[PDB]
Design a protein around this ligand. Sequence first.
Ligand SMILES: *C(=O)[C@@H](NC(=O)Cc1cccs1)[C@@H]1NC(C(=O)O)=C(C)CS1
Length: 256
Amino acid sequence: DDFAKLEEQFDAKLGIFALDTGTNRTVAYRPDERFAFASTIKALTVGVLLQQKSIEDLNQRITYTRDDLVNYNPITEKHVDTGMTLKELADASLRYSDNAAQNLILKQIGGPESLKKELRKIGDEVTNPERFYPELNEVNPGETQDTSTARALVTSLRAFALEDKLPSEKRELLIDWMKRNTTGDALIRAGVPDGWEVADKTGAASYGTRNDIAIIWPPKGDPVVLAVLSSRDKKDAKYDDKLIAEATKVVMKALN
Ligand SMILES: *C(=O)[C@@H](NC(=O)Cc1cccs1)[C@@H]1NC(C(=O)O)=C(C)CS1
């Protein structure tokens, strides 16, 4: 009833799944409820890129133009004349939620259809990548394009970051990028005590969709993998980062 209280306090629908990899103990609330995955998909997208390439292969330089730039391009809008390596695009996507960086990487793996195929191969029958930025933002209730569930995003994030979908040197790159994310200080990080390492990827979309997926390391102990997804009734609705932070506080309470 602490999660229902947050839905009551913030007038929002809330999607929680947490796995303690150390006890296999679980926290869940609407864990199988679909939400627009928003920019959270970028973590799984770098996952597939890392599978498809050697670390040295990430040094390939991608040429792009203004036409590849979309609504939010904080790193890519800077480097049209120089281009950017796949490694630099991975950094821009993960650490700044650069939408153009994600589009370029997605086109590097062979598009949303190709991304879906590789996600099915790792055991994810839930996540439905279909469109590029900006179109994957517009998800109306009941539609399943560009949606996942808290359980599926956690399971998939764990598979790439923590299990055997990637060799250790590639897991280190993904985990390092997500640890040094710049977009998440108000969300999962804000519900976890200082000093604990957090790797995360944020997202925001229509119907006030406000998402964070994370790996949380206690000082010693095995990590927690967490998805906090949320959405609201109205297309143009605002979100509140504080919902995600408080939801995160409730999860840690339930696991400790
Ligand atoms: C993914 O969530 C991305 N969201 C969008 O491109 C849709 C919007 C544009 C402006 C407002 S909503 C990028 N990621 C994030 C994030 O992860 O926090 C934000 C803030 C918007 S761009």
